[PDB]
Amino acid sequence: PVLTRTVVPADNSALFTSVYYVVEGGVLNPACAPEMRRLIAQIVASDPDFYSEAILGKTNQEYCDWIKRDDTWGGAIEISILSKFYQCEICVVDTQTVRIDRFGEDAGYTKRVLLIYDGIHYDPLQRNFTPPLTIFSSNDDIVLVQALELADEARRRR
């Protein structure tokens, strides 16, 4: 099997679209983004201690309106939240430094999903063979290596 990237639009919502795509089994749909944004603000608003001005960068209500916009980018804050929500390990591989950031590594979940990051845009990763495979065992460490190879091949291209 080979690890491949699936291209999602760069319409400011790529993170949300990429996440949705891998938790949902290889479903591409950029319409999930408003409700995914609405969930996020919902979670962030419900705990202004944990999501304070320091952690966020803005004030807790200010951030909730911000992320509800259709032109604002998701970042590690949204990943961490989604990780807890979907009860999943979201692994983000960087094309720029060829490294993996495992969101939810400390919780011990039973599955992990892979995203690829190039500094401004997110795309999702999947296995091909038969429908693509997007969710993997959190004990499958071959996908980690498979992604790195993928990310580095990208890195070469740039």
Binding site: S13, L15, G75, A76, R102, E105
Partner: protein, 76 residues
Amino acid sequence: MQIFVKTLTGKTITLEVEPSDTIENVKAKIQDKEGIPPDQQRLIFAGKQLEDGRTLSDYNIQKESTLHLVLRLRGG
């Protein structure tokens, strides 16, 4: 002096330093440990973002204190 840093991923990073290092130099030691680029790091302690060009212990950071790393990773 030994500190702990809790990352967004959940990992608790223990950093070996002195109370007179720059925050941009903490990000340098963090990069020597996790491969995270300092231009993606945001250090925070006690509900306050730490500014580059400043030393620890300027904000009461003692040994065995817990600071916070928030990755940016914005992408759309």
